[PDB]
Every structure is written in C-alpha cells, then in structure tokens.
Write an enzyme that holds these catalytic residues in place. Structure first.
Site, PDB file in Angstrom:
ATOM      1  N   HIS A 114      81.893 -17.976  56.590  1.00 56.06           N
ATOM      2  CA  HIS A 114      81.808 -19.276  57.219  1.00 56.06           C
ATOM      3  C   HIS A 114      80.405 -19.871  57.142  1.00 56.06           C
ATOM      4  CE1 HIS A 114      80.468 -17.837  61.471  1.00 56.06           C
ATOM      5  NE2 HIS A 114      80.034 -19.093  61.519  1.00 56.06           N
TER       6      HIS A 114
ATOM      7  N   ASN B 274      58.840 -15.891  64.406  1.00 52.88           N
ATOM      8  CA  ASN B 274      58.992 -17.316  64.658  1.00 52.88           C
ATOM      9  C   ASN B 274      59.295 -18.036  63.352  1.00 52.88           C
ATOM     10  OD1 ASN B 274      57.883 -20.183  64.929  1.00 52.88           O
ATOM     11  ND2 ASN B 274      57.414 -19.580  67.018  1.00 52.88           N
TER      12      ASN B 274
ATOM     13  N   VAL C 175      56.990 -21.050  62.290  1.00 53.32           N
ATOM     14  CA  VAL C 175      55.593 -20.803  61.929  1.00 53.32           C
ATOM     15  C   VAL C 175      55.483 -19.715  60.865  1.00 53.32           C
ATOM     16  CG1 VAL C 175      53.281 -20.365  62.859  1.00 53.32           C
ATOM     17  CG2 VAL C 175      55.008 -21.180  64.382  1.00 53.32           C
TER      18      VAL C 175
ATOM     19  N   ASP D 107      85.701 -12.790  57.326  1.00 49.98           N
ATOM     20  CA  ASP D 107      84.458 -13.552  57.365  1.00 49.98           C
ATOM     21  C   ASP D 107      83.189 -12.771  56.937  1.00 49.98           C
ATOM     22  OD1 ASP D 107      82.645 -15.580  57.885  1.00 49.98           O
ATOM     23  OD2 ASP D 107      83.188 -15.821  59.920  1.00 49.98           O
TER      24      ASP D 107
ATOM     25  N   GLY E 103      74.417 -20.618  65.712  1.00 54.76           N
ATOM     26  CA  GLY E 103      73.244 -20.334  64.941  1.00 54.76           C
ATOM     27  C   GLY E 103      73.086 -18.843  64.784  1.00 54.76           C
TER      28      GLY E 103
ATOM     29  N   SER F  75      75.589 -16.858  63.928  1.00 50.97           N
ATOM     30  CA  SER F  75      76.514 -16.503  62.854  1.00 50.97           C
ATOM     31  C   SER F  75      75.895 -15.868  61.608  1.00 50.97           C
ATOM     32  CB  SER F  75      77.260 -17.753  62.402  1.00 50.97           C
ATOM     33  OG  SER F  75      78.179 -18.141  63.472  1.00 50.97           O
ATOM     34  N   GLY F  76      76.654 -14.951  61.023  1.00 50.77           N
ATOM     35  CA  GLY F  76      76.223 -14.272  59.802  1.00 50.77           C
ATOM     36  C   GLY F  76      75.249 -13.141  60.054  1.00 50.77           C
TER      37      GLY F  76
HETATM   38  P1  LIG Z   1      78.068 -19.403  64.351  1.00 51.18           P
HETATM   39  O1  LIG Z   1      78.268 -20.403  63.285  1.00 51.18           O
HETATM   40  O2  LIG Z   1      76.702 -19.486  64.920  1.00 51.18           O
HETATM   41  C1  LIG Z   1      79.390 -19.526  65.629  1.00 51.18           C
HETATM   42  N1  LIG Z   1      80.666 -19.718  64.989  1.00 51.18           N
HETATM   43  C2  LIG Z   1      80.896 -20.965  64.587  1.00 51.18           C
HETATM   44  O3  LIG Z   1      80.702 -21.897  65.361  1.00 51.18           O
HETATM   45  O4  LIG Z   1      82.030 -21.148  63.740  1.00 51.18           O
HETATM   46  C3  LIG Z   1      83.259 -20.381  63.913  1.00 51.18           C
HETATM   47  C4  LIG Z   1      84.243 -21.034  64.896  1.00 51.18           C
HETATM   48  C5  LIG Z   1      85.606 -20.852  64.725  1.00 51.18           C
HETATM   49  C6  LIG Z   1      86.512 -21.421  65.602  1.00 51.18           C
HETATM   50  C7  LIG Z   1      86.053 -22.172  66.673  1.00 51.18           C
HETATM   51  C8  LIG Z   1      84.699 -22.365  66.857  1.00 51.18           C
HETATM   52  C9  LIG Z   1      83.800 -21.793  65.976  1.00 51.18           C
HETATM   53  C10 LIG Z   1      79.429 -18.547  66.807  1.00 51.18           C
HETATM   54  C11 LIG Z   1      79.167 -17.198  66.721  1.00 51.18           C
HETATM   55  C12 LIG Z   1      79.347 -16.418  67.875  1.00 51.18           C
HETATM   56  C13 LIG Z   1      79.771 -16.954  69.089  1.00 51.18           C
HETATM   57  C14 LIG Z   1      79.919 -16.190  70.249  1.00 51.18           C
HETATM   58  N2  LIG Z   1      80.305 -16.752  71.403  1.00 51.18           N
HETATM   59  N3  LIG Z   1      79.754 -14.867  70.272  1.00 51.18           N
HETATM   60  C15 LIG Z   1      79.993 -18.315  69.125  1.00 51.18           C
HETATM   61  C16 LIG Z   1      79.819 -19.097  68.001  1.00 51.18           C
HETATM   62 CA   LIG Z   2      57.786 -17.261  60.377  1.00 49.04          CA
END
Ligand SMILES: *P(=O)(O)[C@@H](NC(=O)OCc1ccccc1)c1ccc(C(=N)N)cc1
Ligand SMILES: [Ca+2]
Length: 223
Positions: free
Chosen positions: A40, A54, A57, A84, A175, A177-178
């Site tokens: 994704h 950071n 920076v 995924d 953010g 994710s991955g």
């Molecule tokens: P990632 O992109 O930071 C995030 N998932 C994302 O938003 O896409 C997948 C998705 C599928 C279906 C509905 C909404 C989103 C993400 C990763 C982890 C969590 C978490 N609560 N552990 C939430 C969003």
């Molecule tokens: Ca840096």
C-alpha cells in the site's frame, strides 16, 4: 506512533524512511540492496533514506539512495489489504555499519504474547494532529488470532496478525505504514492498517512477514 517513546538517534539501524519529496512511509532494510515495506505504500520516485533520526535535519549518518525498482506482491489486494508487502531494490548498495544495519528475516512465525518493537515517524496524536521529527518506538505484544478476529470480524486473513493493547492509547498511526515490527531480532510484521489509531478494541494490524520469507528470498536471488 501513538503512546510510544523517542527511540534515540539511530538505535533502530534497520528503520527506513521512504521519501518522495516528503516522508510518506517507513520501511526495513533487509540486506545491502533491498528494503521491504507495505505494498500500500507503492508509488514511483521513492528515495530510501537510511541512517535517519530527525527526518527534517541532516545530522550526519544518512545514506539517501534512490530506488532502482519495486516489486509489489503479486497477490496484493488493495481493497482488502491482503498480502501488504513490497520489495525495494536500491540504486546503489548501502554501507552497513553499527548505525546502518539490516534486520534478519524470521525462520518461524512469532506467536501471541511475543513482545515486539514497532517504530516510525507517523502521527503521535489521537488528539490534535502532530507529526514528529525523530523516530518514535513502541514495545507491544502480538495479540491472539482470536482477539484480532473478534476485534475486526471478517477482515483478518492468514497473512495478518494484530499487535498492541486492546485498551487503546498505544499504537502505530498514519505515516507509520510500511515500517518494522521486530520481535527477538526478527522482522515479523510490516505496519499495515487499523481503525483510527490507539482506539479501544481496534489494535494495529500487521502483515505476517514469516509467510513471505520464501517469496522474498526467491525475488532477491533473481532481481
Ligand atoms: P499507514 O499508511 O501509515 C496507515 N494505513 C493507511 O492509512 O492505509 C490503510 C487503510 C486501509 C483501510 C482503511 C484505512 C486505512 C495506518 C497504519 C497503522 C494504523 C494503526 N492504527 N495501527 C493506522 C493507519
Ligand atoms: Ca536526518
């Protein structure tokens, strides 16, 4: 990461930032030339950023290497998020040193109760929106297949496990994710989806990496 703590500069030497002009996803370095992340998070024009603390920076320990290629899992379903996972080959190999290092793949799956470490530069607040600068970390347990299914009736496949706290308050978030879920030195999970962040009875859901070890291995041998 919501409810976690500041990791400390470069203490997660395998954590990768995926940047296309701005950080959009995390990842995990698995060898000199390859990174695994969530399928994704695919788009073109990814620059892998290794050695980051950071992300706004330049602090001295970074290696910014462009992606020569990305292979999204052949059975990725974006609708269900089943499978995924995606692999990212680097334009040039990274110089691995104590601060920049690869995580080892699993030979077995981790079970329920195993505490792991999820890290990322994703949102920290389930309050007013806030994105950090430096890497956040969360130590958290893989949950039972059953609580995970009870929590998301009908959405959990065999390549998904839940990890977190059903009480809510600690989780990964937008953010994140991955990026990595490492348990006993092994990359067992990839940050994938969840309902909101840190809510009660809605934990984080992660790609079960032990299921892909063979695909990964075969792909790196031929690409
Ligand atoms: P990632 O992109 O930071 C995030 N998932 C994302 O938003 O896409 C997948 C998705 C599928 C279906 C509905 C909404 C989103 C993400 C990763 C982890 C969590 C978490 N609560 N552990 C939430 C969003
Ligand atoms: Ca840096």
């Amino acid at each position: 990461i919501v409810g976690g703590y500041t990791c400390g500069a470069n203490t997660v030497p395998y954590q990768v930032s995926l940047n296309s002009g701005y950080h959009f996803c995390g990842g995990s370095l698995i060898n000199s030339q390859w990174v695994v992340s969530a399928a994704h998070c695919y788009k073109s024009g990814i620059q892998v950023r290794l050695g980051e603390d950071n992300i706004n920076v330049v602090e001295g320990n970074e290696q910014f290497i462009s992606a020569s290629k990305s292979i999204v899992h052949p059975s990725y379903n974006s609708n269900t998020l089943n499978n995924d996972i995606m692999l990212i080959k680097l334009k040039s190999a990274a110089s691995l040193n104590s601060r920049v290092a690869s995580i080892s793949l699993p030979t077995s799956c981790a079970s329920a109760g195993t505490q792991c470490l999820i890290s990322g530069w994703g949102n920290t607040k389930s309050s007013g929106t806030s994105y950090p600068d430096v890497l956040k970390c969360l130590k958290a347990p893989i949950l039972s297949d059953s609580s995970c299914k009870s929590a998301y009736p009908g959405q959990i496949t065999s390549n998904m496990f839940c990890a977190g706290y059903l009480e809510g308050g600690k989780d990964s978030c937008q953010g994140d994710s991955g990026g990595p879920v490492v348990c006993s030195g092994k990359l067992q999970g990839i940050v994938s989806w969840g309902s909101g962040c840190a809510q009660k009875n809605k934990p984080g859901v992660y790609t079960k990496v032990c299921n892909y070890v063979s695909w990964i291995k075969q792909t790196i041998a031929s690409n």
